[PDB]
Amino acid sequence: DTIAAEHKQEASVLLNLHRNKINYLIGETMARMTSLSIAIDRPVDIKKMQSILEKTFDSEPRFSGLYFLNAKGDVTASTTELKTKVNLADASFFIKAKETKKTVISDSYSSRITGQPIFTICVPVLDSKRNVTDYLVAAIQIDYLKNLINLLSPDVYIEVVNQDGKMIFASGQASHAEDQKPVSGYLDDISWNMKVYPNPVT
Amino acid sequence: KDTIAAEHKQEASVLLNLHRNKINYLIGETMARMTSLSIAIDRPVDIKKMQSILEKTFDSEPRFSGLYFLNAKGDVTASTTELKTKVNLADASFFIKAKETKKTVISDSYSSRITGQPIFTICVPVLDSKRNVTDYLVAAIQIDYLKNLINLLSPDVYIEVVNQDGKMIFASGQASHAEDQKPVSGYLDDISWNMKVYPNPVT
Numbered sequence: 513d514t515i516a517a518e519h520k521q522e523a524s525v526l527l528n529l530h531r532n533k534i535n536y537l538i539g540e541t542m543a544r545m546t547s548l549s550i551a552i553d554r555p556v557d558i559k560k561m562q563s564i565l566e567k568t569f570d571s572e573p574r575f576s577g578l579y580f581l582n583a584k585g586d587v588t589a590s591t592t593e594l595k596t597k598v599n600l601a602d603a604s605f606f607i608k609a610k611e612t613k614k615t616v617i618s619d620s621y622s623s624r625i626t627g628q629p630i631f632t633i634c635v636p637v638l639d640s641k642r643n644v645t646d647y648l649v650a651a652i653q654i655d656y657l658k659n660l661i662n663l664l665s666p667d668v669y670i671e672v673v674n675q676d677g678k679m680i681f682a683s684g685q686a687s688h689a690e691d692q693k694p695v696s697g698y699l700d701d702i703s704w705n706m707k708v709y710p711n712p713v714t
Numbered sequence: 715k716d717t718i719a720a721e722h723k724q725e726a727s728v729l730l731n732l733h734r735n736k737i738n739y740l741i742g743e744t745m746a747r748m749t750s751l752s753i754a755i756d757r758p759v760d761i762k763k764m765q766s767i768l769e770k771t772f773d774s775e776p777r778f779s780g781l782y783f784l785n786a787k788g789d790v791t792a793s794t795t796e797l798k799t800k801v802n803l804a805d806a807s808f809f810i811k812a813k814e815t816k817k818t819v820i821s822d823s824y825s826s827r828i829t830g831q832p833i834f835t836i837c838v839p840v841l842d843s844k845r846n847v848t849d850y851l852v853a854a855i856q857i858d859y860l861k862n863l864i865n866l867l868s869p870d871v872y873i874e875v876v877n878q879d880g881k882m883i884f885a886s887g888q889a890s891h892a893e894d895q896k897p898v899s900g901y902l903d904d905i906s907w908n909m910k911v912y913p914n915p916v917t
Contacts, residue, residue: 567753
C-alpha cells in the first residue's frame, strides 16, 4: 500500500513541474506584450508594429500568431498572412479587455485565423486619457503545451480541464490511470485544472 | 523512523523546486520585459520617452531598486531614482561584460552605487541594426525582495542562498532548524547561485 504512496508523490511532483512550465509561459508572454504596449510611440506606425510583431514571433514555436487590433477590433498587423479582413470585437476576451481595460487571458477556442485550438493573451493599449486605443494579442497553440508535457511525461496520464469541464488537452494513455485518483491543481492566470494520474504499482 | 526522514527530505526537495522556479521566473520575466523594450523602442532613442517608459515600468513593481538607462559611455541618462550627481557605471562588472558580449548579463549581488542597498542587476545591451551597442537598459532588484519571497512561503524552514564562491546571498528562516540536517540543494538557471533547503527534523 506504500509503493502507491511514492507513486502519488511522483505525480504531485509532475503536477508542479508542469504547472510551473505553463505558468511561466503565460507570465512571460504577458510581460512581453505589456512592454510592447508601453513602448509604442503614438500615433502607431502600423508598418513599424508589424515588424516588431515579426521580430517577437521569430523562433517562439509557442505562438500560433501575434496580432494588433484597432479600437474597433480589426486586425491591423499580423504575423499570420491574412486572406480577409478580420474583426474580433465579438470575442469574449476582446469584450472583456475593452470593458476592464486590463490584460486578459482567454479560455481555449478554435482560432478564427488558423482554425486550430489556441488561447490568447490580450493587452489593451491605453491613452493619456486612459481610453483603449488598440489591442495587442498573442495567441498560443494548445498543442504546443500538450507536446511540452508529453515529451517529459509520456507514461503518465495528464488531463487539463477548464472550470466548466471542457477538455483543454490530455497527455498519455488513459489506461495508465485505471483505479487511480488524480492529483490536481489549478494554474495561476487561467482557470484550467491540471490532473496528474499516479502510475499503478506493479 | 527512517520512513519520516525520506518524507521531510522530500518536503524539502519540493521547496527547492518551488523556490528555485520562483526566482528563475522572476529573472526570466524581467529579462523578457527589458528585451521587449529594446525591440520596440523607436531609434535613435529619445531619453524623454525613455525616462517615461522606465517610470511606467517601475510602477507597481516593488521588485526593483530601480530601472536605469545608460548611454554608450555608461552615463545614467534615464533613471527612476532621483539623482543628485551624474553617475557612470562603465567600471561595473556587468557593464564591462555587456559591452563585450553584446548579450544580456545578470550580475552577482552587490551594494547599489545609487541606493546603497544590496541588489543584483539585469543588464540588456541596446543594439543598432549593424549590431553595435548604442545603449544599456539596466534593472536592479533588491536582494531583500527575494529574501521576503522565500520567507513568505517557508518562514519555518532554513534556506541558504550562496554564490559559486561561498558568499552568503541571503538566508531565510532560523538556522536552529538546520541542525543535524543535510540540505537538498541546487543552482539557479541564470545566476550562479546555489540554493540550499534544509529538511525539517522529526517530532
